[PDB]
Amino acid sequence: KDLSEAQVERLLQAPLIDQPLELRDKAMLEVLYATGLRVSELVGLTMSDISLRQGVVRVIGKGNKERLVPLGEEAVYWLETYLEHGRPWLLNGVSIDVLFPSQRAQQMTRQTFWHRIKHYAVLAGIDSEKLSPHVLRHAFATHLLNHGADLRVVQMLLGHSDLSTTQIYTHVATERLRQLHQQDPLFDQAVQFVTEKRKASISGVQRQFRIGYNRAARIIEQMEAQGIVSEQGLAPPPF
């Protein structure tokens, strides 16, 4: 509307993670998707706003009021990965507190990050000129609410109410913070992974090739078709 789930998934998958710059953008997109943060708040995050251990980001929103927004598992993974393996290459020795610095160690603006988002939207087969931040945020929201594994209860009560983007993300943050307060080209690669590791799980295929949940799922499905795996409720091991 006009964005499909499939366009959302391609967009998140488009970044090329051997490039520090795109690995940054990958983390940025995953945070945006999970948290519903505004682009202006995203590009303004500091290192001190993140807690990977707690799984939350601190955002100064309305009234300049600090609140904690749960990041989710994918954003945590890609943040970790970015911090270890991408961000140092963006500084080249320079020392700054900006979480997502530009190519040349400066804070990005909403508009320069938006230029990045347009680049990935093209690869994803999206009209990058028609696309706007509010349409993007709302497609992220809708997709999150419909596929977040921990959000099925929220999906059931509110998925059909056609809430605003902000309302979806507020309900998502509430539910996720409640829980925290309680204590295909990859097919041949995938076949060799599953026949080797012997466990066939959507989660493992997902984290093994760092792809989205639904792509991992459609890869365990192309396998049940071709005769390779046991059914949720078979092929010999290589070597």
Author numbering: 2 to 184, 214 to 263, 271 to 276
Article, verbatim:
A chromosome dimer is lethal if unresolved, but most bacteria encode for an efficient site-specific recombination system to convert the chromosome dimers back to monomers, the Xer site-specific recombination system. Most bacteria encode two tyrosine family recombinases XerC and XerD which bind to the specific chromosomal site dif located in the replication terminus region, although there are notable exceptions where a single Xer protein carries out the reaction. The C-terminal domain of FtsK forms a DNA translocase motor, which also hexamerises, and was found to be essential for chromosome dimer resolution through activation of the XerD recombinase252627. FtsKγ interacts directly with XerD to stimulate its catalytic activity, leading to XerD cutting and exchanging the first pair of strands within a recombinase synapse between dif sites.
To understand how this interaction can lead to activation of recombination, a fusion protein between the C-terminal domain of XerD, which contains the catalytic residues required for DNA cleavage and strand exchange, and FtsKγ was produced (XerDC–γ) and crystallized. The asymmetric unit contained a single XerDC–γ complex, but the flexible linker joining the two protein domains was not visible in the density. The FtsKγ interaction with XerDC is a 563 Å2 interface that involves two helices on the surface of XerDC. These two helices, αE and αH, are on the opposite face from the putative DNA-binding surface of XerD and the active-site residues32. The interaction site on FtsKγ involves the ends of helices α2 and α3 and the loop that joins them3031. It is noteworthy that this is also a region involved in binding of FtsKγ to KOPS DNA, and the amino acids that contact XerD are a subset of those seen to contact DNA; not only is FtsKγ a bi-functional domain with protein-protein and protein-DNA interactions, it uses the same surface to carry out both functions. Although the structure of the fusion protein reveals an interaction surface that is consistent with the proposed role of FtsKγ interacting with and activating XerD whilst it is bound to DNA, there was no obvious structural change in XerD that would account for its activation; the active site residues were in the same, inactive, conformation as seen in the XerD structure without γ present. The E184-R1289 pair interact with each other via a salt bridge and hydrogen bonding in the crystal structure that, based on recombination efficiency, appears to be a critical factor in the interaction.
